[PDB]
């Protein structure tokens, strides 16, 4: 063996490392088995360094501690190999070991849904006829929704410009493109492959699915049609959210009003207690099974569309070189994938609720309820599940237990799961954002009741459909020991404290909702708002992404990107900024990085060279037009004792300074409040 034969064998190594990155199995015919044993060994050596460096740098990026601009893109590319590789492993394990649902499970699941639709007397959605009265308007709504991307961006590639021309043809000849869409729903069952690209959000990496534009049009028409026909027929009940009737902060307001309005929720005269439950529904879209899914859709949709939908989920998935077929999981990137996800949500809702109580929540089919309304109080008093809603995969349940019912419920869990050491307080989780007095106290009676609540709910749903775990679960119990009912809505962290348990009544700043009973018109509870910690890190990730995308970008673009991100935070979070101290720190550190980006553009970071007149003057006078949020005295009060109780605002930390004093106004004044 010479310098020639040693030169060719090092190719197989380079080729096989590409194959491992591609997740393509590397097999060379006629390769000697000792050498193939050697090469596979060093790849797995290199694989461990390739994977562990990818883990180690994600922990750096989430901390935010000095990651190079190239290293962010490299780590973005390393994860999306690993995520799709984990996806392709999971597809093969389902294929080898069969569907995760057992045939007894799927029979019961199907029987529940048939019983619900028959109880509602739901009539199935037909295929859209050739003469359809709303056919031109629904087609327009789909194309406008596809069009709304284009007005924003300037330059377009070939696939974008193809998608322009296809929509423009559909404007010109609506009747011609309707017949084409009606044809593809009938006949087409094999589709073009779909590209995954991943968005970097610095705390997670999120998938974005690109559908071929000719297929994208007929999906968008189908989506507009199915959502309209479902709402005409009132398919989805009131608990399924978002309503299309309310914004997510109004959703928090009605829900928090809805807890207060329900009778006797605050009374702890007897031993009765109130429980709110929060879980994610796990990988809900990921665990959908198509054979179950096609069988479920035939109840409600004409089978030609239901055959289209199931075939549309099964497509080839393409990364830069890797490719696999989605045998199992739901593609969320489809335009009609919202309709599957909420409908598969309805099946899970019936499993938790049961056939009887879901009728009470929805009301009768002729006169369905409001989102928090029952027909009579006696309907309300039965069956301890008081309020229910489901945002997407987040589940919110409100339980009211009598002392007898709570004791029965908690003993049988201790029967099934005992604790001699009484370590139920250890694995429990609650909000660490609130003070220690203010968060839920770990009284062993209430903690045992909270776990018994979750254990009842976890048993109702099979693990094959969704993964419901205690670690994702947030349960709060209201009792004589706990005057605080805690939950987390879309981005809000809410403390609901009733008026009589307040132990003194003080006026509050406007970060406090006053909850009104409907029949008294008297304010009988106070809802306390904070921005969730997850949303704070999410806003910090946006500021980083503005800075990281802008290499040598002009000053007015960076200022405009700051304004549109700052308004998006403040207009959505209007009433929960004021309580949250950590968000106010991120607003200061965020805004001064934008000002440093201008100060990096010029070669001086000096303070006196840049008076606040430079940044905050409007564009019509030549300034950047930056919108201010951090020229604010930030409340500082005694971090040793602020974890214990709510100290109140006793001292003010300075937010932003300059040599020359200017009292720059802040938008929170200029945005009228949610309540």
192 binds, among another protein, RNA, none (CB under 5 to 8 A by kind): another protein
Out of 294, 338, 369, 563, the residue judged to bind another protein by CB under 8 A:
294
| 239-278 binders of another protein (CB under 8 A) | none
Instruction: State the Cα–Cα distance between residues 202 and 354, nearest whole angstrom.
Output: 40
**Least CB distance to RNA at residue 69 (A):** 12
644 binds, among RNA, another protein, none (CB under 5 to 8 A by kind): none
10 binds another protein (CB under 8 A): yes
648 binds RNA (CB under 7 A): no
Candidates 213-221, 277-285, 322-330, 603-611 — which segment interacts with RNA by CB under 7 A?
603-611
Q: Which helix (H) or strand (E) holds 639?
A: helix 639-642
How far is the CA of 641 from the CAs of 436, 636, 638, 645, in angstroms?
A: 10, 11, 6, 7
268-284 burial, b for 16+ CB within 10 Å, e for fewer?
beeebbbbbbbbbbbeb
Residues in a beta bridge with 523 = 516
Out of 91, 592, 617, 637, the residue judged to bind RNA by CB under 7 A:
592
304 binds another protein (CB under 8 A): no
Query: How far, in whole angstroms, is CA 6 from its chain's centroid?
Result: 53
Which CB, 70 or 657, lies closer to RNA? 657
| 608-627 binders of RNA (CB under 7 A) | 608-609
**Least CB distance to another protein at residue 627 (A):** 18
30 binds, among RNA, another protein, none (CB under 5 to 8 A by kind): another protein
Instruction: State the number of binding residues for another protein (CB under 8 A).
Output: 117
Give me 385's structure tokens: 């599940």
662 binds another protein (CB under 8 A): no
Candidates 27-35, 272-280, 604-612, 640-648 — which segment interacts with RNA by CB under 7 A?
604-612
Out of 603, 620, 663, 669, the residue judged to bind RNA by CB under 7 A:
603
**Least CB distance to RNA at residue 327 (A):** 48
Provide the 8-state DSSP code for 301.
B
Instruction: Report whether 388 contacts 398 (CB < 8 A).
Output: yes
Provide the 8-state DSSP code for 266.
S
H helices present in 461-580, as ranges = 533-549, 555-572
608-632 burial, b for 16+ CB within 10 Å, e for fewer?
eebebebbbeeeeeebbbbbbbbbb
Which residue is associated with the tokens 């290293």? Answer: 71
Query: How far, in whole angstroms, is CA 448 from its chain's centroid?
Result: 29
370 binds another protein (CB under 8 A): no
How far is the CA of 540 from the CAs of 139, 325, 384, in angstroms?
A: 39, 36, 41
What is the contact mask toward another protein in residues 571 to 600, using x (rule: CB under 8 A)?
------------------------------
What is the contact mask toward another protein in residues 210 to 229, using x (rule: CB under 8 A)?
--x-----------------
264 binds, among RNA, another protein, none (CB under 5 to 8 A by kind): none
51 binds another protein (CB under 8 A): yes
Which CB, 385 or 527, lies closer to another protein? 385
H helices present in 27-157, as ranges = 33-63, 69-97, 103-120, 135-147
232 binds another protein (CB under 8 A): no
Nearest to 655 by CA among 587, 597, 593, 600: 587
Nearest to 581 by CA among 653, 512, 518, 641: 653
Long-range residue pairs from 597-604, CB within 8 A, at least 24 positions apart, any chain: 597/547, 597/550, 597/558, 598/555, 598/558, 598/559, 598/624, 601/552, 601/555
Task: List the Cα angle 226/393/411 in 5-degree steps.
Answer: 130
| 130-169 binders of another protein (CB under 8 A) | 158-159, 162, 165
Nearest to 277 by CA among 140, 142, 398: 398
Residues in a beta bridge with 530 = 493
**Least CB distance to another protein at residue 614 (A):** 5
432 binds, among another protein, RNA, none (CB under 5 to 8 A by kind): none
Which CB, 325 or 613, lies closer to RNA? 613
356 binds another protein (CB under 8 A): yes
Question: Taking the alpha carbons of 601, 605, 606, 608 in that order, is the dihedral positive or negative?
Answer: positive
**Least CB distance to another protein at residue 299 (A):** 8
Which CB, 331 or 629, lies closer to RNA? 629
605 binds RNA (CB under 7 A): yes
Which CB, 233 or 658, lies closer to RNA? 658
E-strand ranges in 178-219 read: 194-200, 205-210
Out of 69, 73, 86, 168, the residue judged to bind another protein by CB under 8 A:
86
193 binds another protein (CB under 8 A): yes
Residues in a beta bridge with 316 = 325
Out of 35, 71, 414, 505, the residue judged to bind another protein by CB under 8 A:
35
Q: Determine what percent of the chain falls in helix, strand and coil, rounding each to the nearest 5.
A: 50, 10, 40
592 binds, among RNA, another protein, none (CB under 5 to 8 A by kind): RNA
9 binds, among RNA, another protein, none (CB under 5 to 8 A by kind): another protein
Instruction: Report whether 575 contacts 511 (CB < 8 A).
Output: yes
Query: How far, in whole angstroms, is CA 182 from its chain's centroid?
Result: 33
Out of 128, 249, 384, 406, the residue judged to bind another protein by CB under 8 A:
384
Out of 607, 618, 648, 665, the residue judged to bind RNA by CB under 7 A:
607
Residue 358 CB: number of other CB atoms within 10 A? 22
654 binds RNA (CB under 7 A): yes
What is the contact mask toward another protein in residues 423 to 462, using x (rule: CB under 8 A)?
---------------------------------x--xxxx
104 binds another protein (CB under 8 A): yes
| 473-532 binders of another protein (CB under 8 A) | none
77 binds another protein (CB under 8 A): no
| 333-372 binders of RNA (CB under 7 A) | none
Candidates 52-60, 369-377, 505-513, 644-652 — which segment interacts with another protein by CB under 8 A?
52-60
Which residues here bind RNA, judged by CB under 7 A? Answer: 592, 603-609, 651, 654, 656-659
């Amino acid at each position: 063996i010479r310098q020639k034969k040693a030169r060719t064998i090092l190719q197989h190594l380079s080729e096989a490392w590409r194959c491992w990155k591609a997740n393509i199995p590397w097999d060379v015919p006629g390769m000697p088995a000792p050498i193939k044993k050697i090469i596979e060994r060093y790849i797995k050596s290199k694989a461990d360094a390739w994977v562990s460096a990818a883990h180690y740098n994600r922990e750096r990026i989430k901390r935010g501690a000095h990651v190079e601009k190239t290293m962010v893109k490299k780590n973005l590319g390393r994860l999306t190999r690993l995520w799709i590789k984990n996806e392709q492993e999971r597809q093969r394990q389902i294929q080898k070991n069969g569907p995760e649902i057992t045939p007894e499970e799927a029979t019961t699941i199907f029987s529940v849904m048939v019983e619900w639709l028959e109880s509602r007397s739901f009539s199935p959605i037909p295929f859209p006829p050739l003469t359809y009265k709303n056919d031109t308007k629904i087609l327009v709504l789909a194309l406008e929704d596809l069009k709304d991307v284009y007005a924003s961006k300037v330059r377009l590639n070939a696939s974008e410009r193809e998608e322009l021309a296809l929509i423009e043809e559909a404007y010109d000849n609506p009747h011609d493109t309707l017949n084409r869409i009606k044809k593809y729903l009938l006949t087409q069952r094999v589709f073009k492959p779909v590209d995954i690209t991943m968005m970097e959000n610095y705390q997670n990496i999120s998938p974005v699915y690109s559908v071929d534009p000719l297929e994208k049009i007929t999906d968008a028409y189908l989506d507009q049609y199915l959502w309209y026909e479902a709402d005409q027929r009132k398919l989805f009940p009131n608990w399924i959210k978002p309503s299309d009737s309310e914004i997510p902060p109004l959703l928090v307001y009605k829900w928090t009003q809805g807890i207060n309005n329900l009778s006797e929720i605050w009374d702890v005269s007897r031993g009765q207690s109130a429980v709110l439950l929060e879980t994610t529904l796990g990988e809900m879209a990921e665990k959908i099974d198509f054979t179950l899914l096609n069988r479920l859709l035939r109840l409600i949709v004409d089978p030609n569309i239901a055959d289209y939908i199931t075939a549309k989920n099964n497509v080839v998935i393409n990364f830069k070189d890797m490719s696999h077929v989605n045998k199992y999981g739901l593609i969320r990137g489809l335009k009609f994938a919202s309709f599957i996800f909420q409908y598969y949500g309805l099946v899970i809702d019936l499993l938790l609720l049961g056939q009887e109580r879901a009728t009470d929540l929805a009301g009768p089919a002729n006169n369905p309820n409001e989102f928090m309304q029952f027909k009579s109080k006696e309907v309300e008093k039965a069956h301890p599940i008081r309020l229910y809603t489901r945002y997407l995969d987040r589940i919110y349940m409100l339980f009211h237990f009598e002392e007898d019912e709570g004791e029965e419920l908690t003993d049988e869990y201790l029967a099934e799961n005992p604790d001699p050491n009484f370590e139920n307080s250890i694995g429990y989780n609650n909000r660490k954002c609130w003070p220690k007095d203010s968060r839920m106290r770990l009284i062993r009676q209430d903690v045992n009741l909270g776990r018994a609540v979750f254990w009842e709910i976890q048993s109702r749903v099979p693990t094959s459909l969704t993964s419901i775990k205690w670690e994702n679960a947030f349960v709060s119990v209201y009792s004589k020991n706990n005057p605080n009912l805690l939950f987390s809505m879309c981005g809000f962290e809410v403390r609901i404290l009733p008026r009589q348990r307040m132990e003194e009544v003080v006026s509050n700043d406007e970060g406090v909702w006053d909850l009104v009973d409907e029949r008294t018109k008297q304010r009988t509870a106070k809802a306390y708002l904070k921005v969730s910690e997850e949303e704070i890190k999410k806003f910090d990730s946006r500021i980083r992404g503005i800075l990281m995308a802008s290499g040598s970008t002009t000053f007015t673009k960076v200022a405009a990107k700051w304004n549109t991100s700052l308004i998006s935070l403040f207009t959505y979070f209007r009433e929960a900024i004021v309580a949250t101290e950590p968000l106010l720190d991120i607003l200061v550190k965020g805004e001064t990085r934008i000002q440093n980006r201008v100060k990096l553009g010029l070669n001086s970071k000096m303070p006196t060279r840049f008076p606040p007149a430079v940044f905050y003057t409007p564009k019509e006078l030549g300034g950047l037009g930056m919108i201010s949020a951090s020229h604010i005295l930030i409340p500082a009060s005694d971090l040793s004792w602020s974890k214990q109780t709510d100290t109140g605002i006793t001292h003010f930390r300075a937010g932003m300074t300059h040599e020359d004093e200017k009292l720059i106004p802040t938008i929170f004044r200029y945005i009228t409040t949610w309540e």
